[PDB]
């Protein structure tokens, strides 16, 4: 077990199209699935999950290849990976629509599922990453203050296993720099928290799987150019950190091209890692958006 499971929750596995997915489940009621992003695992949701479990059945998978999940068999593109996560959620809510909360490349791996199966989604919460589309070719390689937000797209996508070869052996060192350079609040990342995340993604198959999502990013862009001809119909909320490392106004501005019904918030003084940097205000916003009118 890689991370402490909170009590009242169970750590379990489920085979989906030949791939064994790890998840943490708890609570009772309508389903809410929480999908983490790069450098992390299900554990980033460990403070929201008990609060949501009071009202919902909460399931928090590890992405294929990451955490304690097997690599995917089809591929790492958004449409491929989303089949895994959609069948997982339907095994737990086969007859009713469920809610989705996704962070970072969790958005990448769920947007195809959402737009193709709109009646299975009651409400949608996306935070802190672009849906893969042509807007990603517009982020600067460099800024007047130093390194830019997403130069690591090219780093991770590079041929010849460039990023795995350089980072291997120095996984804790890199992940700490990556996290801190995308955070405003750098002190919430304790030496133990950093150690837990660094151990998980240092697994050779997990290191590789991390960058394959990025090596598939151009394919996901081409998939979403087709899929985005149907706007999202479920009530949608976007969240972004307004401090150093966050997406700022970009998150809502992009979503205006996707959602009929969108609520947007920018958390002042918070970077990329909203669940840990700004736990209280973030949890409050998710809990309220999923609870209003029910």
């Amino acid at each position: 077990e890689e991370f402490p499971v909170p009590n009242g929750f169970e750590s379990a596995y489920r085979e989906v199209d030949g791939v064994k997915l790890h998840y943490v489940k708890g609570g009772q009621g309508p389903l809410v699935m929480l999908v983490h992003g790069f450098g992390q695992t299900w554990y980033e949701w460990h403070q929201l999950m008990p609060e949501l479990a009071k009202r919902f059945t909460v399931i928090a998978p590890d992405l294929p290849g990451l955490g304690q999940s097997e690599p995917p068999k089809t591929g790492y593109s958004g449409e491929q990976v989303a089949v895994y996560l959609h069948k997982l959620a339907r095994q737990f809510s086969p007859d009713r629509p469920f809610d989705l909360v996704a962070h970072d490349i969790g958005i990448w791996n769920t947007y195809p599922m959402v737009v193709k199966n709109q009646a299975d989604i009651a409400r949608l919460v996306y935070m802190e990453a672009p849906i893969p589309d042509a807007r990603i070719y517009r982020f600067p390689a460099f800024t007047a203050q130093g390194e830019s937000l997403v130069w690591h797209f090219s780093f991770f996508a590079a041929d010849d296993r460039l990023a795995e070869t350089l980072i291997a052996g120095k996984e804790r060192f890199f992940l700490e720099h990556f996290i801190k350079s995308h955070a405003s609040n750098t002190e919430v990342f304790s030496e133990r928290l950093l150690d837990l995340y660094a151990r998980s993604y240092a697994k050779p198959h997990s290191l590789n799987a991390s960058f394959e999502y990025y090596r598939a990013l151009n394919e996901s862009v081409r998939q979403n150019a087709e899929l985005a001809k149907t706007r999202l119909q479920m009530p949608t909320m976007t969240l972004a950190g307004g401090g150093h490392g966050g997406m700022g106004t970009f998150q809502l501005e992009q979503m205006k091209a996707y959602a009929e019904d969108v609520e947007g918030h920018v958390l002042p003084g918070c970077g990329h890692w909203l669940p840990e940097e700004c736990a209280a205000p973030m949890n409050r916003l998710v809990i309220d958006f999923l609870s209003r009118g029910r």
Partner: nanobody, 122 residues
Framework: VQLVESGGGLVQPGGSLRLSCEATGNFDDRGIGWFRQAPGKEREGIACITTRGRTHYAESVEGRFTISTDIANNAVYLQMNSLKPEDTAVYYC????????????????????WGRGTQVTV
């Protein structure tokens, strides 16, 4: 330009109208809004409905106007009860967004082609 406005006209205070926004083709995306523009004043979003049926009204027209979707006829209607001289403007329908920041408003979808609209005079 895939939405054509009709149903306007000259009316007196207290009168009522039904505006029609008709789709010219496919009608799977029914997140559509009604906008009005007075001669000098800016464009304002006054009512929108999402495909799933969620309405929002501008405070200036709430309680008087109703927006509904006629799926079978590929149209969105603006039932305007109790018109007033303040409601005199050109009315446009377009693909729209129910957008909530610190409040909720109806705004147009980025970069829509605005059509002819229909005049409503009181």
């Amino acid at each position: 330009v895939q939405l054509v406005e009709s149903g306007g006209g000259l009316v007196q205070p207290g009168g009522s109208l039904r505006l029609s926004c008709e789709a010219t083709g496919n009608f799977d995306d029914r997140g559509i809004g009604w906008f009005r523009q007075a001669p000098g004043k800016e464009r304002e979003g006054i009512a929108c409905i999402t495909t799933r049926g969620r309405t929002h009204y501008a405070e200036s027209v709430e309680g008087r106007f109703t927006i509904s979707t006629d799926i079978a006829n590929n149209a969105v209607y603006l039932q305007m009860n109790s018109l007033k001289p303040e409601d005199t403007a050109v009315y446009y329908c377009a693909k729209a967004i129910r957008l909530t920041t610190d409040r909720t408003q109806c705004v147009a979808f980025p970069g829509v082609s605005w059509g002819r609209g229909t005049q409503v005079t009181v």
